[PDB]
Each structure stands twice: as C-alpha cells, then as structure tokens.
Scaffold this active site. Structure first.
Site, short mmCIF file in Angstrom:
data_model
loop_
_atom_site.label_atom_id
_atom_site.label_comp_id
_atom_site.label_asym_id
_atom_site.label_seq_id
_atom_site.Cartn_x
_atom_site.Cartn_y
_atom_site.Cartn_z
CG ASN A 116 -0.27 -0.17 2.57
OD1 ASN A 116 0.59 -1.04 2.72
ND2 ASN A 116 -0.60 0.53 3.64
CG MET A 117 2.37 2.77 -2.69
SD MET A 117 2.61 3.01 -4.46
CE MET A 117 3.98 4.12 -4.35
CD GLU A 118 -0.80 5.31 4.36
OE1 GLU A 118 -0.01 5.95 5.05
OE2 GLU A 118 -1.46 4.39 4.81
CG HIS A 121 -6.48 -0.06 -0.35
ND1 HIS A 121 -6.94 -0.24 0.89
CD2 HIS A 121 -6.92 1.17 -0.77
CE1 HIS A 121 -7.68 0.80 1.18
NE2 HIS A 121 -7.67 1.65 0.20
CD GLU A 175 -6.15 -5.74 -0.31
OE1 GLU A 175 -5.28 -4.96 0.05
OE2 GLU A 175 -7.18 -5.89 0.33
CB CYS A 184 -10.73 -2.22 2.87
SG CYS A 184 -10.44 -1.56 1.21
CB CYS A 198 -9.50 -4.24 -1.71
SG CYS A 198 -8.32 -2.85 -1.52
N1 LIG Z 1 -6.33 -5.11 4.00
C1 LIG Z 1 -5.83 -3.88 3.97
C2 LIG Z 1 -6.22 -2.91 4.94
C3 LIG Z 1 -5.75 -1.65 4.87
N2 LIG Z 1 -4.92 -1.32 3.84
C4 LIG Z 1 -4.37 0.20 3.74
O1 LIG Z 1 -3.64 0.28 4.97
C5 LIG Z 1 -3.72 1.67 5.24
C6 LIG Z 1 -4.61 2.00 6.36
O2 LIG Z 1 -5.93 1.66 5.96
C7 LIG Z 1 -3.98 2.41 3.93
O3 LIG Z 1 -2.75 2.59 3.27
C8 LIG Z 1 -4.83 1.49 3.19
O4 LIG Z 1 -4.69 1.50 1.75
C9 LIG Z 1 -4.52 -2.20 2.87
O5 LIG Z 1 -3.92 -1.86 1.85
C10 LIG Z 1 -4.94 -3.55 3.03
ZN LIG Z 2 -8.23 -2.22 0.57
#
Ligand SMILES: Nc1ccn([C@@H]2O[C@H](CO)[C@@H](O)[C@H]2O)c(=O)c1
Ligand SMILES: [Zn+2]
Ligand SMILES: Nc1ccn([C@@H]2O[C@H](CO)[C@@H](O)[C@H]2O)c(=O)c1
Ligand SMILES: [Zn+2]
Lengths: 294, 294
Positions: free
Chosen positions: A89-91, A102, A104, A129, A132
């Site tokens: 995942n990237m923010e 995410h 996935e 989530c 996804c």
């Molecule tokens: N099953 C999950 C749950 C959360 N996240 C992510 O983790 C972080 C907090 O929700 C965010 O980066 C969000 O994209 C995932 O990628 C995978």
């Molecule tokens: Zn997700």
C-alpha cells in the site's frame, strides 16, 4: 539487497533466506517471482504454494509507503502464468485519501500492467477492505478469485462480498484484465508514446475516457500506468497510481522521477489532469505534460 | 412539487399519493421526513416502517444526478431520532470517478450533517457496493447497522462485510457520528464561519487534517460539508461532497452556487484544496476561497 528488505529478510527461516538471497541480491529485484523461482523456493523449503506466499508476505509488506498510517500491508497476486507479483500500500502526503493505493490494488495492477492475463489467487496479510473487495470484482476472475489471509481458510471472493454489485449490474461484459486495445496512434517522444500506449490498454467501459500516465526516471527508465475503472466508480485506479505502483515496486523512489506525461481525450466526460498534476507536485515532480488522444 | 418528483409520484399507490401530496407540495421539500410524518404515512396506508421505506425509494432515487451511468439509486437512512433522510447518488462530469458520491454516502451524510446522533437502519434499492459497506463500518453503529434491500431479508452490516476491516484495526475509538468538536475559532464572514464550523465537526482521526467546505447560493442559502475519513482511507467523504449532497437534496442545482469557501490547516498532511477547486470549476463555480485553520 535493497535496504527496505533488510529487516524482513533477517526474520526469515534459514533455508528460505538461503533460497532467496541470490534473487534479492539485486537492488532492483523486480518485486515479482517467476514460476521457476517459486519451484526452487518450494524445493529449498518444503513449503507448498499457499504457505510460501504467506512466508513471503513480509517482503511484500516491506515495499509499503505508509507516512500517514505506518500500517504496512503486503499482498501477492498469483498469476495464471505462475508468476507471483508483490504489491504493497502507498499513501501520499500532500494529496487526499482518494489517492491512496491498497496492497491488493498494487498487486493486481502490477500483474495487469506486466501483461498477466488473469489471476488465480491473491494472498494479503490483513483482511481486504470493502473498497478492494469491490476492486477485485471488476476482474475477469469474478467472484471466484481465491483470497488467502493469515490464519484463515481460503475463500472465494463471493464469500467476502455476499450479494455483490459489479460489472454485470451495469450490463458490462468486458472485464479488467481482458484483452483491450483502443487503437490510438502513438506519437511524440518516448514518454508520450508510453503514455498513449498505456491509454490504449485502459479499462474504461463506464465513462469511455481512456487515459495513461508515463513517468521518466533520471536514469531514463519509463514506468507507465493505465486507467482502470470500476463499476462502483470510486474504486477506479487512476493512471498515475499505476505508474507509481510500478516505480516503487521496481526499487525506485519519488526523487528520481524526472518528468511525466498524461495522455487523455480533451472532450472526455472525466478528466485526470488536475489530480495527476496535483499529486505529482506533492511528490515533487513539476514537469508534467499532457498529450491529447484523437 | 419539485419536477424531479413528478414521474416517481405518479407511479405511487393512491392512498400514499394522498398522504404525501401535502408534504411534497413545496418545491424545497427537504428530502427528509420527521417521525410525525412517517406515523401519518403509516396510518394512511397501513404500511409498516420497512415497507414504507421501500415504497418511498422512488422519490429518493428521483434525487440522483447520474450523467455518466443513468443508474439512479435511492437510499433512506433512518435516524435513531425517527427522522428519515433521503440520499441519492451523484456523478460529476469534468471530474474523476473518485469524486462520485453513492446513495448510501448521501443518506448517511444527510443524517450526520443534519445533527443525527446514530442510525438504526438504511434501506437502498440496489445492493451496496463494497466501498459503501466499508463507509458504513466507520459509523458508531458498527457492524450491527441493518441494511434493507428490495426483495431480501434484512441483514446487519456484518453479514454483508464478513471479516471486516474498520477503525478498531487502526486502534481508533472515536467513530463517525460520535460527538466531535475540534475547537477552531470561527472568523471571517458568514461563509467562512460556516466552513470553519463544518471543519470543527469533521471526523479525521487518521490524518488529523480537519476541513469543511461551505457553499453560498444565489438566494443566500448556505450549505456546509464536513470531512469524514474512513479507516480504509479511500471511502473518505471529501468536505465538498457533503455540501453538494445537501444542496442537491434540498432542491437546488449547481447553477445557483454563488461562491464557496474551503477551510483547512496549511500544514495538514492531506490537502483538499486542489480537488475542491477542480470539481467546483467543473461544476461552473469559479469563486472559491480558502480559509486557514489555526
Ligand atoms: N487489507 C488492507 C487494509 C488496509 N490497507 C491500507 O492500509 C492503510 C490504512 O488503511 C492504507 O494505506 C490502506 O490503503 C490495505 O492496503 C490492506
Ligand atoms: Zn483495501
Ligand atoms: N448500490 C449502489 C450501486 C451503485 N451506486 C452508484 O451507481 C452508479 C453506478 O455505479 C454510481 O453513481 C455509483 O455511486 C450506488 O450509489 C448504489
Ligand atoms: Zn456504493
């Protein structure tokens, strides 16, 4: 070994460390494993495919960029070819929550963009989530995709998304990862052509607005992302995110993006230009050009 | 009667048309019904609450703005107060798929923004997408919220989102629709103060970036939207969308937005300014100011 893998690797089982250490030697290990490589790993450890995927999730999670949450999640998409694609995942600081990718989405886009025709399963270290689960129902694998989570029995996507909404509901019959080519002529320099080629592969049955972004790195490596719509609209993966997923998984960092190009129609009902510019400027790139498709 | 309701109303049962016709007389009927009004409707028809909610879904769906899909979806959120809030989906030409609001998000934001403290159930005329199942798990109602869909047995949210991800996973204990007040001093004119007050109510435990948008109409009516984050990040409702949900449900249209204000911190890790400006310009508003919180 790319330093991001150092602690993860240190926590691995000895015979697995031994099998992986040649593969992870290279700083630019492509966050992917071929069928031949997963066979070797199975012979070196005795692990079967599902257990190997779980044992490897720490290296996938090691590719996460999580400045807001510090919640690193790794995913591994197993292609029908036998190649395993990592995803994390990237923010993005300075952008919005809608620009988040995410784990996935990262692993599925890695597979689709690499030319994978369909997925057999995905392994994630935290339960998906709902955003996804909906993303995954866009795929040609439909509700049959197998989801593997630590400490649970595997399940198809239909078990995690009971009474699902998806393409069928809007009478769409072309699914993400199906063969698509929209036929725009490639023109311009290397980067413009990469962007238009990316736009040619986009999944856009709902708005008919094709787009693609291509990022040129300081060493001349180009990373391109195609646009992938979703029937529930908001889980759509913007073109920029595809490019950034590949840049990060292949071992690069935002500082070495040199210039970017976004290709799209001017008259399209949805416009990617503003979110692409804004997020790239937040990341520090300021050389963004737009190419128009016709 | 606001013309959007004309065909919907024509398709209603006679005794229901009779009970509603005083209520829907007003062009600016607030797309909401008080406890007293649902009691009257029950006495005039013999319908119980769940059947009445289903019979009313055509009027909720009549508020949908769907230029891309032409797929109108209505939702009705039933507050713990007894007030029923309508909600409908909105799609914005010239923006991106990430700016879309779903009927469920519309109905829940209508309730939260109106001051509702919690929901008891939501009735939707199409099964929820995974993005909205995740949105709904942000609420203080948790997985117990009852979802009612045409032709199905009611179910709690836990049945539609098995093995759910949500606030608890990121150790968050303040939930959407809980009492929040961040304490920024209101300053500026009427619109700036509306925007800051909206920012004071925002649900933002993950990035700590409060924001609120307020829209001033040509007749001086102000509509404000607070920011509501989501644990899965992307289902977050931006501040602008809240304001636009209220503007549309209360009977107005984008042509009568006169000016808008966005209030937010300058140093916040996430920034709403660019997506707010861009979407409002796509809608035709060009007078957007930003107010900084301190
Ligand atoms: N099953 C999950 C749950 C959360 N996240 C992510 O983790 C972080 C907090 O929700 C965010 O980066 C969000 O994209 C995932 O990628 C995978
Ligand atoms: Zn997700
Ligand atoms: N249960 C649903 C399913 C789809 N949509 C929406 O319908 C359209 C097509 O997905 C979009 O506006 C999207 O927000 C809803 O709101 C409710
Ligand atoms: Zn939805």
């Amino acid at each position: 070994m790319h330093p991001r893998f150092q602690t993860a690797f240190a926590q691995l089982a000895d015979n697995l460390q031994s099998a992986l250490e040649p593969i992870l030697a290279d700083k630019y290990f492509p966050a992917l494993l071929t069928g031949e490589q997963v066979s070797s790993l199975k012979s070196a450890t005795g692990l079967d495919e599902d257990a190997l995927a779980f044992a490897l999730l720490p290296l996938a999670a090691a590719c996460a960029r999580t400045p807001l949450s510090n919640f690193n999640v790794g995913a591994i998409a197993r292609g029908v070819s036998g190649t395993w694609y990592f995803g994390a995942n990237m923010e993005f600081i300075g952008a919005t929550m809608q620009q988040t990718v995410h784990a996935e989405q990262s692993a599925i886009s890695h597979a689709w963009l690499s030319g994978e025709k369909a997925l057999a399963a995905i392994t994630v270290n935290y339960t998906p989530c709902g955003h996804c689960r909906q993303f995954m129902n866009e795929l040609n694998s439909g509700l049959d995709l197998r989801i593997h989570l630590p400490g649970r029995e595997a399940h198809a996507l239909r078990d995690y998304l009971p009474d699902a909404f998806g393409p069928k509901d809007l009478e769409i019959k072309t699914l993400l990862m199906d063969e698509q080519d929209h036929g725009y002529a490639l023109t311009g320099d290397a980067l413009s052509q990469a962007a238009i080629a990316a736009a040619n592969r986009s999944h856009m049955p709902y708005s008919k607005s094709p787009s693609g972004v291509a990022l040129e790195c300081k060493d001349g490596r180009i990373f391109s992302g195609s646009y992938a719509e979703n029937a529930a609209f908001n889980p759509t993966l913007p073109p920029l995110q595809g490019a950034l997923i590949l840049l990060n998984l292949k071992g690069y960092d935002y500082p070495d993006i040199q210039r970017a190009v976004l290709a799209e129609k001017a008259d399209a009902p949805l416009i990617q230009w503003d979110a692409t510019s804004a997020t790239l400027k937040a990341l520090g790139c300021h050389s963004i050009d737009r190419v128009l498709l016709a």
